[PDB]
């Protein structure tokens, strides 16, 4: 299995699925490195973020657990197709990249925070991460190139 995939059992249904402990992605199908990748992300900050402030909210007060629940809801609506990743990043990302639909441009290793970097480089093109934790907050990462 590609980098960091394991076989697990759905707790609710009992069907097997695949989980990636680097990206925190999970999927029902058997899963299908470059010098540079390009990603967008959607950041949700919380009271313990390195800088608990964003363009959206001067004083970010939500708990890490509340931030994780918001991230989980966004992932749900993105996966269902009710919402676009780009639309949710634009409206709700606690990052200045919200104005660019979460786009961060391309980058190589050695630039981003390590958990973010590892997830970015373990994603396949077009693939989306699960919740990814950094000192900034909680990210959803979409690898675009
Ligand atoms: S699974 O066992 O791969 C799995 C269980 C729970 C989570 C979670 O995000 O709470 C993810 C994967």
Tokens of 20: 């990636």
Any ligand 1 atom below 6 A from CB of 53: no
Q: For residues 139 and 42, what is the distance between their CA atoms, to the nearest angstrom? A: 5
Whole-number Å distance between alpha carbons of 4 and 109: 18
Domain architecture of the chain: domains with CATH = 1-31 (2.20.70.10), 36-145 (3.10.50.40)
Spatial distance between the Cα atoms of 105 and 12, rounded to a whole number of angstroms: 38
Q: Residue 95's closest CA among 130, 62, 55?
A: 55
Which atom number of ligand 1 is nearest to the Cα of residue 131? 9
Technique behind the model: X-ray
The partner residues of 145 in beta bridges, in order of sequence, read: none
Name the residue of 20, 26, 131 to mutate for ligand 1: max ligand atoms within 8 A of Cβ.
26
Q: What does DSSP assign to residue 98?
A: G
- Judge whether 34 and 104 are in contact, CB under 8 Å: no
For residue 8, the tally of other CB atoms under 10 A from its CB is 11
């Amino acid at each position: 299995l590609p980098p960091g995939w394991e076989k697990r059992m759905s707790r609710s249904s009992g069907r097997v699925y695949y989980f990636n402990h680097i990206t925190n992605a999970s999927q029902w199908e058997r899963p299908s490195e470059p010098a540079r990748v390009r990603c967008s992300h959607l950041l949700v900050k919380h009271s313990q973020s390195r800088r608990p402030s964003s363009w959206r909210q001067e004083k970010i007060t939500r708990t890490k657990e509340e931030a994780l629940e918001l991230i989980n809801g966004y992932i749900q609506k993105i996966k269902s197709g009710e919402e676009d990743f780009e639309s949710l990043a634009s409206q709700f990302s606690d990052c200045s990249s919200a104005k660019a639909r979460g786009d961060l441009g391309a980058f190589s290793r050695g630039q981003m925070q390590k958990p973010f970097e590892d997830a970015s480089f373990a994603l396949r093109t077009g693939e989306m991460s699960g919740p990814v934790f950094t000192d900034s907050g909680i990210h959803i990462i979409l690898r675009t190139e």
